[PDB]
Amino acid sequence: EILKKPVTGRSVWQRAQVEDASQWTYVLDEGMRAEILEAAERINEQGLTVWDLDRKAVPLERAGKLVAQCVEQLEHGFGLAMLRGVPTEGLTVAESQVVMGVVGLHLGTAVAQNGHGDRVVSIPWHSDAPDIAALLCLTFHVASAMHIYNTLLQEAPELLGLYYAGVFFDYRGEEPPGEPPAYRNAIFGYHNGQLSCRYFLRNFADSGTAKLGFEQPEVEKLALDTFEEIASRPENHVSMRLEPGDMQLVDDNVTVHRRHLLRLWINVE
Amino acid sequence: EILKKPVTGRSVWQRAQVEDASQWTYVLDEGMRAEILEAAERINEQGLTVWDLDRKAVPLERAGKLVAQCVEQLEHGFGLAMLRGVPTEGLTVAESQVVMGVVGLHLGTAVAQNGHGDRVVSIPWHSDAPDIAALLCLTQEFHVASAMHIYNTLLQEAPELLGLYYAGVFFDYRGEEPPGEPPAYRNAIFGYHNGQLSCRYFLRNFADSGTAKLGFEQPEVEKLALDTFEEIASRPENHVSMRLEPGDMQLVDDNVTVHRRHLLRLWINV
Ligand SMILES: [Mg+2]
Numbered sequence: 001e002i003l004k005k006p007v008t009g010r011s012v013w014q015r016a017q018v019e020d021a022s023q024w025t026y027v028l029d030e031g032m033r034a035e036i037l038e039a040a041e042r043i044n045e046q047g048l049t050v051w052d053l054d055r056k057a058v059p060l061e062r063a064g065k066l067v068a069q070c071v072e073q074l075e076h077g078f079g080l081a082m083l084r085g086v087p088t089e090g091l092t093v094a095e096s097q098v099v100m101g102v103v104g105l106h107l108g109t110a111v112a113q114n115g116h117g118d119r120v121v122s123i124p125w126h127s128d129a130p131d132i133a134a135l136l137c138l139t140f141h142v143a144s145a146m147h148i149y150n151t152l153l154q155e156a157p158e159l160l161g162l163y164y165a166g167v168f169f170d171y172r173g174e175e176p177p178g179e180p181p182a183y184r185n186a187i188f189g190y191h192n193g194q195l196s197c198r199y200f201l202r203n204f205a206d207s208g209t210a211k212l213g214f215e216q217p218e219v220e221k222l223a224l225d226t227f228e229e230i231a232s233r234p235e236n237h238v239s240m241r242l243e244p245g246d247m248q249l250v251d252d253n254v255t256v257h258r259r260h261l262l263r264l265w266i267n268v269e
Numbered sequence: 270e271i272l273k274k275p276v277t278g279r280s281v282w283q284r285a286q287v288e289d290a291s292q293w294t295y296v297l298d299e300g301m302r303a304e305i306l307e308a309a310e311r312i313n314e315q316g317l318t319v320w321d322l323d324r325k326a327v328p329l330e331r332a333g334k335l336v337a338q339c340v341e342q343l344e345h346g347f348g349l350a351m352l353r354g355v356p357t358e359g360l361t362v363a364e365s366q367v368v369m370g371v372v373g374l375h376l377g378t379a380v381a382q383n384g385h386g387d388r389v390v391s392i393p394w395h396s397d398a399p400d401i402a403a404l405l406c407l408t409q410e411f412h413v414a415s416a417m418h419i420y421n422t423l424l425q426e427a428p429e430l431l432g433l434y435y436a437g438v439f440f441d442y443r444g445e446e447p448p449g450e451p452p453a454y455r456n457a458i459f460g461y462h463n464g465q466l467s468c469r470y471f472l473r474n475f476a477d478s479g480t481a482k483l484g485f486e487q488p489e490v491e492k493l494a495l496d497t498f499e500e501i502a503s504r505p506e507n508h509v510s511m512r513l514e515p516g517d518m519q520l521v522d523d524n525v526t527v528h529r530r531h532l533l534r535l536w537i538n539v
Protein backbone atom coordinates (compact mmCIF):
# COMPACT_ATOMS: atom_id res chain seq x y z
CA GLU A 1 0.00 0.00 0.00
CA ILE A 2 3.00 2.25 0.57
CA LEU A 3 5.40 2.91 -2.29
CA LYS A 4 8.86 2.06 -1.01
CA LYS A 5 10.84 2.72 -4.14
CA PRO A 6 11.15 5.87 -6.27
CA VAL A 7 8.20 6.85 -8.47
CA THR A 8 8.93 7.09 -12.21
CA GLY A 9 7.24 8.85 -15.14
CA ARG A 10 6.92 12.12 -17.05
CA SER A 11 5.46 13.83 -13.98
CA VAL A 12 8.68 13.30 -12.02
CA TRP A 13 10.81 16.37 -12.66
CA GLN A 14 12.90 19.24 -11.36
CA ARG A 15 13.10 22.82 -12.64
CA ALA A 16 15.75 22.07 -15.29
CA GLN A 17 13.47 19.71 -17.25
CA VAL A 18 10.51 22.10 -17.54
CA GLU A 19 12.25 25.47 -17.58
CA ASP A 20 11.88 25.47 -21.35
CA ALA A 21 8.18 26.33 -21.29
CA SER A 22 7.87 25.60 -25.02
CA GLN A 23 7.45 21.91 -24.18
CA TRP A 24 4.18 22.61 -22.36
CA THR A 25 2.93 25.87 -23.83
CA TYR A 26 0.03 25.71 -26.27
CA VAL A 27 -0.93 28.73 -28.37
CA LEU A 28 -4.40 29.37 -29.79
CA ASP A 29 -4.22 30.83 -33.31
CA GLU A 30 -6.77 33.17 -34.91
CA GLY A 31 -8.94 30.32 -36.19
CA MET A 32 -9.14 28.72 -32.76
CA ARG A 33 -9.84 32.05 -31.02
CA ALA A 34 -12.63 32.66 -33.53
CA GLU A 35 -14.13 29.19 -32.99
CA ILE A 36 -14.15 29.61 -29.21
CA LEU A 37 -15.64 33.11 -29.38
CA GLU A 38 -18.25 31.87 -31.84
CA ALA A 39 -19.14 28.96 -29.56
CA ALA A 40 -19.54 31.26 -26.56
CA GLU A 41 -21.58 33.66 -28.69
CA ARG A 42 -23.93 30.88 -29.77
CA ILE A 43 -24.29 29.71 -26.17
CA ASN A 44 -25.23 33.26 -25.16
CA GLU A 45 -27.61 33.75 -28.10
CA GLN A 46 -29.50 30.60 -27.16
CA GLY A 47 -29.68 31.53 -23.49
CA LEU A 48 -27.84 28.36 -22.52
CA THR A 49 -25.59 27.84 -19.51
CA VAL A 50 -22.18 26.48 -20.50
CA TRP A 51 -21.99 24.46 -17.26
CA ASP A 52 -25.00 22.39 -18.29
CA LEU A 53 -23.43 21.50 -21.61
CA ASP A 54 -21.04 18.80 -22.74
CA ARG A 55 -18.30 18.66 -25.38
CA LYS A 56 -20.36 17.11 -28.18
CA ALA A 57 -22.73 20.05 -27.81
CA VAL A 58 -19.90 22.57 -28.27
CA PRO A 59 -17.50 21.09 -30.84
CA LEU A 60 -14.18 22.82 -31.48
CA GLU A 61 -12.61 21.11 -34.49
CA ARG A 62 -9.22 22.83 -34.40
CA ALA A 63 -9.14 24.18 -30.83
CA GLY A 64 -10.31 20.89 -29.32
CA LYS A 65 -7.12 19.46 -30.75
CA LEU A 66 -4.92 21.84 -28.77
CA VAL A 67 -6.91 21.56 -25.56
CA ALA A 68 -6.66 17.78 -25.93
CA GLN A 69 -2.90 18.17 -26.14
CA CYS A 70 -3.15 20.11 -22.91
CA VAL A 71 -5.10 17.33 -21.21
CA GLU A 72 -2.45 14.89 -22.43
CA GLN A 73 0.33 16.98 -20.93
CA LEU A 74 -1.60 17.28 -17.65
CA GLU A 75 -2.67 13.66 -17.08
CA HIS A 76 0.20 11.85 -18.82
CA GLY A 77 2.97 14.43 -19.19
CA PHE A 78 4.69 16.95 -16.94
CA GLY A 79 1.41 17.72 -15.19
CA LEU A 80 1.34 21.41 -16.09
CA ALA A 81 0.40 23.18 -19.33
CA MET A 82 -0.23 26.72 -20.52
CA LEU A 83 -2.89 27.63 -23.05
CA ARG A 84 -2.11 31.05 -24.51
CA GLY A 85 -4.28 33.41 -26.53
CA VAL A 86 -7.58 32.73 -24.79
CA PRO A 87 -9.78 35.39 -26.45
CA THR A 88 -10.65 37.52 -23.41
CA GLU A 89 -9.66 40.90 -24.76
CA GLY A 90 -12.49 43.40 -24.57
CA LEU A 91 -14.88 40.99 -22.86
CA THR A 92 -16.83 41.47 -19.63
CA VAL A 93 -16.05 39.17 -16.71
CA ALA A 94 -19.21 37.09 -17.31
CA GLU A 95 -18.44 36.72 -21.03
CA SER A 96 -14.89 35.65 -20.17
CA GLN A 97 -16.41 33.16 -17.73
CA VAL A 98 -18.40 31.70 -20.62
CA VAL A 99 -15.36 31.54 -22.93
CA MET A 100 -13.41 29.77 -20.17
CA GLY A 101 -16.36 27.43 -19.76
CA VAL A 102 -16.17 26.62 -23.46
CA VAL A 103 -12.48 25.74 -23.17
CA GLY A 104 -13.23 23.87 -19.94
CA LEU A 105 -15.70 21.52 -21.62
CA HIS A 106 -12.74 20.15 -23.59
CA LEU A 107 -10.67 19.76 -20.43
CA GLY A 108 -13.24 17.65 -18.61
CA THR A 109 -16.06 18.20 -16.15
CA ALA A 110 -16.32 21.50 -14.28
CA VAL A 111 -17.04 21.05 -10.58
CA ALA A 112 -18.31 23.21 -7.72
CA GLN A 113 -15.71 25.34 -5.94
CA ASN A 114 -17.91 26.48 -3.06
CA GLY A 115 -21.22 25.96 -1.27
CA HIS A 116 -22.95 28.24 -3.77
CA GLY A 117 -21.96 25.73 -6.46
CA ASP A 118 -19.85 28.19 -8.44
CA ARG A 119 -17.87 26.72 -11.34
CA VAL A 120 -15.79 29.85 -11.84
CA VAL A 121 -14.22 31.86 -9.05
CA SER A 122 -12.93 35.41 -9.41
CA ILE A 123 -9.58 36.12 -7.75
CA PRO A 124 1.50 28.35 0.67
CA TRP A 125 2.22 25.32 -1.52
CA HIS A 126 -0.96 23.36 -2.24
CA SER A 127 -2.92 21.21 -4.65
CA ASP A 128 -6.72 21.42 -4.69
CA ALA A 129 -9.32 18.62 -4.83
CA PRO A 130 -10.04 18.34 -8.56
CA ASP A 131 -7.78 16.66 -11.13
CA ILE A 132 -7.01 19.91 -12.93
CA ALA A 133 -6.91 23.49 -11.69
CA ALA A 134 -7.08 26.25 -14.29
CA LEU A 135 -6.27 29.95 -13.92
CA LEU A 136 -6.99 32.48 -16.67
CA CYS A 137 -5.51 35.96 -16.61
CA LEU A 138 -7.96 38.71 -17.56
CA THR A 139 -5.78 41.63 -16.49
CA PHE A 140 2.93 31.47 -10.31
CA HIS A 141 5.10 28.58 -9.08
CA VAL A 142 4.74 24.84 -9.79
CA ALA A 143 6.64 21.83 -8.42
CA SER A 144 6.43 18.07 -8.90
CA ALA A 145 4.85 16.27 -5.93
CA MET A 146 6.26 13.02 -7.31
CA HIS A 147 9.80 14.41 -7.12
CA ILE A 148 8.94 15.52 -3.60
CA TYR A 149 8.00 11.93 -2.84
CA ASN A 150 11.35 10.69 -4.16
CA THR A 151 13.18 13.33 -2.13
CA LEU A 152 11.30 12.23 1.01
CA LEU A 153 12.25 8.65 0.18
CA GLN A 154 15.88 9.77 0.26
CA GLU A 155 15.97 12.29 3.12
CA ALA A 156 13.11 11.36 5.48
CA PRO A 157 11.47 7.99 4.72
CA GLU A 158 10.42 7.60 8.38
CA LEU A 159 7.80 10.26 7.67
CA LEU A 160 6.18 8.57 4.66
CA GLY A 161 3.46 6.77 6.61
CA LEU A 162 2.31 10.08 8.08
CA TYR A 163 1.51 11.44 4.62
CA TYR A 164 -0.49 8.30 3.88
CA ALA A 165 -2.47 8.92 7.07
CA GLY A 166 -3.03 12.53 6.08
CA VAL A 167 -4.39 15.30 8.26
CA PHE A 168 -7.73 16.79 9.28
CA PHE A 169 -9.18 19.53 7.10
CA ASP A 170 -12.01 21.88 7.91
CA TYR A 171 -15.31 20.95 6.31
CA ARG A 172 -16.25 24.62 6.33
CA GLY A 173 -19.77 23.64 7.35
CA GLU A 174 -20.59 21.24 4.53
CA GLU A 175 -20.21 17.98 6.54
CA PRO A 176 -23.16 15.59 6.29
CA PRO A 177 -25.03 15.69 9.63
CA GLY A 178 -23.73 13.41 12.38
CA GLU A 179 -20.08 13.64 11.38
CA PRO A 180 -17.25 15.86 12.68
CA PRO A 181 -16.43 19.34 11.34
CA ALA A 182 -13.07 18.21 9.89
CA TYR A 183 -12.38 15.21 7.63
CA ARG A 184 -9.15 13.26 7.22
CA ASN A 185 -7.44 13.70 3.86
CA ALA A 186 -4.37 11.69 2.84
CA ILE A 187 -1.45 13.58 1.33
CA PHE A 188 0.01 10.62 -0.56
CA GLY A 189 -1.78 7.56 -1.86
CA TYR A 190 -0.68 4.52 -3.83
CA HIS A 191 -3.45 2.66 -5.65
CA ASN A 192 -3.65 0.61 -8.85
CA GLY A 193 0.06 1.08 -9.48
CA GLN A 194 -0.13 4.85 -9.34
CA LEU A 195 1.06 7.32 -6.72
CA SER A 196 -1.05 10.45 -6.32
CA CYS A 197 -0.87 13.50 -4.07
CA ARG A 198 -3.13 16.09 -2.51
CA TYR A 199 -1.72 18.86 -0.34
CA PHE A 200 -4.76 20.87 0.67
CA LEU A 201 -4.51 24.39 2.11
CA ARG A 202 -2.72 23.87 5.41
CA ASN A 203 -4.57 26.53 7.35
CA PHE A 204 -7.84 24.81 6.74
CA ALA A 205 -5.91 21.97 8.35
CA ASP A 206 -5.28 24.19 11.37
CA SER A 207 -8.84 25.48 11.28
CA GLY A 208 -10.09 21.88 11.12
CA THR A 209 -8.02 20.47 13.97
CA ALA A 210 -9.00 23.50 16.04
CA LYS A 211 -12.66 22.72 15.34
CA LEU A 212 -11.96 19.13 16.43
CA GLY A 213 -10.38 20.48 19.61
CA PHE A 214 -6.92 18.97 19.10
CA GLU A 215 -3.32 20.14 18.92
CA GLN A 216 -1.28 19.02 15.92
CA PRO A 217 1.42 16.50 16.81
CA GLU A 218 4.85 18.04 16.26
CA VAL A 219 5.91 15.22 13.93
CA GLU A 220 2.94 16.10 11.73
CA LYS A 221 4.04 19.73 11.51
CA LEU A 222 7.53 18.45 10.71
CA ALA A 223 6.13 16.33 7.88
CA LEU A 224 4.18 19.27 6.43
CA ASP A 225 7.07 21.74 6.80
CA THR A 226 9.43 19.21 5.19
CA PHE A 227 7.07 18.77 2.24
CA GLU A 228 6.83 22.53 1.69
CA GLU A 229 10.58 23.05 2.18
CA ILE A 230 11.37 20.45 -0.47
CA ALA A 231 8.94 22.15 -2.85
CA SER A 232 10.52 25.53 -2.03
CA ARG A 233 14.06 24.57 -3.12
CA PRO A 234 14.99 26.62 -6.22
CA GLU A 235 15.89 23.45 -8.15
CA ASN A 236 12.48 21.86 -7.48
CA HIS A 237 10.04 24.44 -8.87
CA VAL A 238 9.42 26.42 -12.04
CA SER A 239 8.05 29.97 -12.03
CA MET A 240 6.02 31.96 -14.56
CA ARG A 241 4.10 35.18 -15.25
CA LEU A 242 0.65 35.16 -16.86
CA GLU A 243 -0.36 37.81 -19.38
CA PRO A 244 -3.98 38.49 -20.37
CA GLY A 245 -5.29 35.52 -22.35
CA ASP A 246 -2.92 33.11 -20.62
CA MET A 247 -4.56 30.13 -18.98
CA GLN A 248 -2.27 28.13 -16.72
CA LEU A 249 -3.29 24.55 -15.96
CA VAL A 250 -1.89 22.29 -13.24
CA ASP A 251 -2.63 18.62 -12.53
CA ASP A 252 -3.35 18.26 -8.83
CA ASN A 253 -2.56 14.53 -8.85
CA VAL A 254 1.16 15.04 -9.46
CA THR A 255 2.00 18.71 -8.80
CA VAL A 256 1.67 21.39 -6.13
CA HIS A 257 1.53 25.14 -6.81
CA ARG A 258 1.62 28.61 -5.27
CA ARG A 259 0.83 32.21 -6.29
CA HIS A 260 -7.86 39.85 -12.21
CA LEU A 261 -7.92 36.06 -12.62
CA LEU A 262 -10.64 33.43 -13.03
CA ARG A 263 -10.33 29.91 -11.63
CA LEU A 264 -11.84 26.67 -12.91
CA TRP A 265 -11.90 23.22 -11.30
CA ILE A 266 -11.95 20.24 -13.62
CA ASN A 267 -12.27 16.52 -13.01
CA VAL A 268 -11.21 14.16 -15.78
CA GLU A 269 -14.01 11.60 -15.92
CA GLU B 270 13.65 13.84 17.32
CA ILE B 271 13.04 10.53 15.59
CA LEU B 272 15.55 7.81 16.35
CA LYS B 273 17.07 6.39 13.15
CA LYS B 274 19.62 3.97 14.58
CA PRO B 275 19.11 0.82 16.68
CA VAL B 276 18.53 1.10 20.42
CA THR B 277 21.25 -0.51 22.51
CA GLY B 278 21.26 -1.48 26.16
CA ARG B 279 20.08 -4.20 28.50
CA SER B 280 16.43 -3.44 27.80
CA VAL B 281 16.97 -4.54 24.19
CA TRP B 282 16.38 -8.28 24.03
CA GLN B 283 14.76 -11.30 22.42
CA ARG B 284 13.58 -14.50 24.09
CA ALA B 285 17.09 -15.99 23.96
CA GLN B 286 18.60 -13.30 26.22
CA VAL B 287 15.91 -13.67 28.89
CA GLU B 288 14.95 -17.35 28.62
CA ASP B 289 17.02 -18.17 31.68
CA ALA B 290 14.89 -16.55 34.35
CA SER B 291 17.65 -16.81 36.98
CA GLN B 292 19.03 -13.56 35.53
CA TRP B 293 15.91 -11.64 36.57
CA THR B 294 14.36 -13.66 39.43
CA TYR B 295 14.71 -12.47 43.03
CA VAL B 296 13.78 -14.77 45.90
CA LEU B 297 12.53 -13.64 49.32
CA ASP B 298 13.90 -15.83 52.11
CA GLU B 299 12.07 -16.61 55.38
CA GLY B 300 13.55 -13.60 57.19
CA MET B 301 12.38 -11.23 54.46
CA ARG B 302 8.93 -12.85 54.33
CA ALA B 303 8.58 -12.56 58.11
CA GLU B 304 9.72 -8.95 57.83
CA ILE B 305 6.98 -8.17 55.30
CA LEU B 306 4.32 -10.02 57.30
CA GLU B 307 5.27 -8.15 60.48
CA ALA B 308 5.10 -4.81 58.70
CA ALA B 309 1.65 -5.74 57.37
CA GLU B 310 0.48 -6.89 60.82
CA ARG B 311 1.59 -3.59 62.32
CA ILE B 312 -0.20 -1.66 59.57
CA ASN B 313 -3.45 -3.57 60.12
CA GLU B 314 -3.26 -3.41 63.92
CA GLN B 315 -2.69 0.34 63.94
CA GLY B 316 -5.54 0.93 61.51
CA LEU B 317 -3.25 2.63 59.01
CA THR B 318 -3.68 2.53 55.24
CA VAL B 319 -0.60 1.30 53.38
CA TRP B 320 -1.41 3.46 50.33
CA ASP B 321 -1.04 6.67 52.34
CA LEU B 322 2.33 5.68 53.82
CA ASP B 323 5.83 6.07 52.44
CA ARG B 324 8.92 3.94 52.18
CA LYS B 325 10.60 5.34 55.31
CA ALA B 326 7.55 4.63 57.46
CA VAL B 327 7.64 0.97 56.47
CA PRO B 328 11.36 0.08 56.41
CA LEU B 329 12.41 -3.40 55.30
CA GLU B 330 16.00 -3.99 56.41
CA ARG B 331 16.73 -7.16 54.42
CA ALA B 332 13.88 -7.25 51.90
CA GLY B 333 14.21 -3.65 50.77
CA LYS B 334 17.62 -4.39 49.26
CA LEU B 335 16.22 -7.25 47.16
CA VAL B 336 13.29 -5.10 46.05
CA ALA B 337 15.82 -2.41 45.16
CA GLN B 338 17.58 -4.88 42.86
CA CYS B 339 14.16 -5.51 41.29
CA VAL B 340 13.74 -1.78 40.65
CA GLU B 341 17.24 -1.50 39.19
CA GLN B 342 16.51 -4.45 36.91
CA LEU B 343 13.30 -2.80 35.78
CA GLU B 344 14.54 0.73 35.11
CA HIS B 345 18.11 -0.03 33.96
CA GLY B 346 18.18 -3.75 33.11
CA PHE B 347 15.96 -6.08 31.08
CA GLY B 348 12.82 -4.25 32.19
CA LEU B 349 11.19 -7.26 33.79
CA ALA B 350 11.75 -9.01 37.09
CA MET B 351 10.07 -11.69 39.17
CA LEU B 352 9.86 -11.40 42.95
CA ARG B 353 9.24 -14.83 44.45
CA GLY B 354 8.09 -15.89 47.91
CA VAL B 355 5.74 -12.99 48.66
CA PRO B 356 4.07 -14.25 51.82
CA THR B 357 0.43 -14.54 50.84
CA GLU B 358 -0.24 -18.08 52.14
CA GLY B 359 -3.34 -18.23 54.33
CA LEU B 360 -4.21 -14.57 53.91
CA THR B 361 -7.51 -12.99 52.95
CA VAL B 362 -7.64 -10.90 49.77
CA ALA B 363 -7.54 -7.63 51.75
CA GLU B 364 -4.60 -8.87 53.82
CA SER B 365 -2.78 -9.91 50.65
CA GLN B 366 -3.51 -6.43 49.31
CA VAL B 367 -1.80 -4.95 52.35
CA VAL B 368 1.25 -7.22 51.94
CA MET B 369 1.50 -6.21 48.28
CA GLY B 370 1.23 -2.59 49.38
CA VAL B 371 4.17 -3.15 51.70
CA VAL B 372 6.30 -4.50 48.86
CA GLY B 373 5.01 -1.72 46.59
CA LEU B 374 6.24 1.03 48.90
CA HIS B 375 9.79 -0.05 48.04
CA LEU B 376 9.05 -0.03 44.30
CA GLY B 377 7.76 3.54 44.19
CA THR B 378 4.43 5.34 44.41
CA ALA B 379 1.23 3.36 43.90
CA VAL B 380 -1.32 5.13 41.71
CA ALA B 381 -5.07 4.86 41.08
CA GLN B 382 -6.18 2.34 38.46
CA ASN B 383 -9.83 3.39 38.08
CA GLY B 384 -12.38 6.12 38.80
CA HIS B 385 -12.94 4.92 42.35
CA GLY B 386 -9.21 5.34 42.96
CA ASP B 387 -8.47 1.67 43.66
CA ARG B 388 -4.73 0.99 43.81
CA VAL B 389 -5.09 -2.80 43.70
CA VAL B 390 -7.21 -4.57 41.11
CA SER B 391 -8.34 -8.19 41.40
CA ILE B 392 -8.16 -10.47 38.36
CA PRO B 393 -3.63 -7.61 23.01
CA TRP B 394 0.04 -6.81 23.62
CA HIS B 395 0.09 -3.66 25.71
CA SER B 396 1.93 -1.55 28.24
CA ASP B 397 0.01 0.38 30.89
CA ALA B 398 0.38 4.05 31.90
CA PRO B 399 2.63 3.83 35.00
CA ASP B 400 6.38 3.12 35.04
CA ILE B 401 5.96 -0.33 36.56
CA ALA B 402 3.12 -2.84 36.44
CA ALA B 403 3.04 -5.51 39.14
CA LEU B 404 1.09 -8.77 39.13
CA LEU B 405 0.96 -11.07 42.17
CA CYS B 406 -0.51 -14.51 42.13
CA LEU B 407 -2.67 -15.48 45.11
CA THR B 408 -4.10 -18.69 43.62
CA GLN B 409 -3.40 -20.47 40.34
CA GLU B 410 0.71 -17.85 30.88
CA PHE B 411 2.24 -14.37 31.04
CA HIS B 412 4.20 -13.09 28.04
CA VAL B 413 6.67 -10.20 27.87
CA ALA B 414 8.49 -8.56 24.95
CA SER B 415 11.03 -5.75 24.56
CA ALA B 416 9.55 -2.56 23.09
CA MET B 417 13.08 -1.44 22.25
CA HIS B 418 13.71 -4.56 20.17
CA ILE B 419 10.31 -4.06 18.54
CA TYR B 420 11.46 -0.55 17.67
CA ASN B 421 14.68 -1.90 16.11
CA THR B 422 12.67 -4.43 14.12
CA LEU B 423 10.45 -1.61 12.87
CA LEU B 424 13.59 0.30 11.91
CA GLN B 425 14.68 -2.67 9.78
CA GLU B 426 11.45 -3.95 8.25
CA ALA B 427 9.16 -0.91 8.11
CA PRO B 428 10.89 2.42 8.83
CA GLU B 429 8.25 4.24 6.75
CA LEU B 430 5.82 3.62 9.64
CA LEU B 431 8.03 5.08 12.36
CA GLY B 432 6.60 8.61 12.26
CA LEU B 433 3.09 7.26 12.78
CA TYR B 434 4.11 5.81 16.13
CA TYR B 435 5.52 9.18 17.10
CA ALA B 436 2.18 10.78 16.25
CA GLY B 437 0.35 8.15 18.26
CA VAL B 438 -3.34 7.34 18.19
CA PHE B 439 -6.54 8.33 19.98
CA PHE B 440 -7.54 6.34 23.05
CA ASP B 441 -10.91 6.40 24.74
CA TYR B 442 -10.96 8.45 27.92
CA ARG B 443 -13.53 6.06 29.35
CA GLY B 444 -15.51 9.13 30.42
CA GLU B 445 -12.97 10.84 32.70
CA GLU B 446 -12.36 13.43 30.05
CA PRO B 447 -12.35 16.80 31.76
CA PRO B 448 -15.81 17.88 30.80
CA GLY B 449 -14.45 20.38 28.31
CA GLU B 450 -12.46 17.94 26.06
CA PRO B 451 -13.22 15.21 23.43
CA PRO B 452 -14.06 11.75 24.72
CA ALA B 453 -10.68 10.50 23.56
CA TYR B 454 -7.07 11.70 23.95
CA ARG B 455 -4.01 11.35 21.71
CA ASN B 456 -1.26 9.08 23.01
CA ALA B 457 2.13 8.67 21.35
CA ILE B 458 3.45 5.12 21.02
CA PHE B 459 7.12 6.02 20.72
CA GLY B 460 8.96 9.04 22.04
CA TYR B 461 12.55 10.12 21.96
CA HIS B 462 13.73 12.79 24.36
CA ASN B 463 16.86 13.36 26.43
CA GLY B 464 18.73 10.63 24.67
CA GLN B 465 16.15 8.03 25.69
CA LEU B 466 13.52 6.20 23.63
CA SER B 467 10.35 5.23 25.47
CA CYS B 468 7.20 3.38 24.53
CA ARG B 469 3.56 3.17 25.53
CA TYR B 470 1.22 0.82 23.69
CA PHE B 471 -2.13 1.30 25.39
CA LEU B 472 -5.00 -1.19 25.03
CA ARG B 473 -6.05 -1.35 21.38
CA ASN B 474 -9.73 -1.81 22.04
CA PHE B 475 -9.70 1.62 23.65
CA ALA B 476 -7.96 2.99 20.57
CA ASP B 477 -10.81 1.75 18.39
CA SER B 478 -13.42 2.77 20.97
CA GLY B 479 -11.74 6.16 21.23
CA THR B 480 -11.63 6.94 17.52
CA ALA B 481 -15.21 5.67 17.24
CA LYS B 482 -16.38 8.15 19.86
CA LEU B 483 -14.74 10.92 17.84
CA GLY B 484 -16.78 9.82 14.83
CA PHE B 485 -13.73 8.92 12.77
CA GLU B 486 -12.52 5.92 10.80
CA GLN B 487 -9.06 4.64 11.58
CA PRO B 488 -6.74 5.14 8.63
CA GLU B 489 -5.57 1.86 7.07
CA VAL B 490 -1.89 2.76 7.45
CA GLU B 491 -2.58 3.22 11.18
CA LYS B 492 -4.04 -0.27 11.57
CA LEU B 493 -1.05 -1.49 9.60
CA ALA B 494 1.28 0.19 12.10
CA LEU B 495 -0.56 -1.29 15.10
CA ASP B 496 -0.84 -4.77 13.57
CA THR B 497 2.86 -4.68 12.64
CA PHE B 498 3.85 -3.73 16.20
CA GLU B 499 1.82 -6.60 17.63
CA GLU B 500 2.91 -9.11 14.97
CA ILE B 501 6.53 -8.36 15.78
CA ALA B 502 5.83 -8.80 19.49
CA SER B 503 4.00 -12.08 18.80
CA ARG B 504 6.91 -13.75 17.00
CA PRO B 505 8.08 -16.72 19.15
CA GLU B 506 11.70 -15.54 19.13
CA ASN B 507 10.67 -12.08 20.36
CA HIS B 508 8.83 -12.79 23.63
CA VAL B 509 9.37 -14.76 26.83
CA SER B 510 6.64 -16.71 28.61
CA MET B 511 6.15 -17.74 32.24
CA ARG B 512 3.60 -19.16 34.66
CA LEU B 513 3.08 -17.55 38.06
CA GLU B 514 2.84 -19.67 41.20
CA PRO B 515 1.29 -18.40 44.45
CA GLY B 516 3.64 -15.82 45.96
CA ASP B 517 5.11 -14.85 42.58
CA MET B 518 4.96 -11.15 41.75
CA GLN B 519 5.88 -10.32 38.15
CA LEU B 520 7.04 -6.76 37.51
CA VAL B 521 7.26 -5.19 34.05
CA ASP B 522 8.68 -1.81 33.11
CA ASP B 523 6.19 -0.11 30.82
CA ASN B 524 8.83 2.23 29.41
CA VAL B 525 10.74 -0.56 27.67
CA THR B 526 8.49 -3.64 27.58
CA VAL B 527 5.04 -4.78 26.45
CA HIS B 528 3.12 -7.70 27.97
CA ARG B 529 0.14 -10.01 27.49
CA ARG B 530 -1.98 -12.46 29.47
CA HIS B 531 -6.75 -14.89 41.44
CA LEU B 532 -4.14 -12.19 40.82
CA LEU B 533 -3.72 -8.70 42.22
CA ARG B 534 -2.42 -5.86 40.10
CA LEU B 535 -0.50 -2.82 41.33
CA TRP B 536 0.55 0.29 39.39
CA ILE B 537 3.78 2.06 40.34
CA ASN B 538 5.49 5.30 39.34
CA VAL B 539 9.18 5.65 40.28
MG1 LIG C 1 -5.09 26.93 -6.33
Ligand SMILES: [Mg+2]
Binds near residue numbers: 397402528
Ligand atom coordinates in the same frame (compact mmCIF):
# COMPACT_ATOMS: atom_id res chain seq x y z
MG1 LIG D 1 -1.73 -5.52 31.96
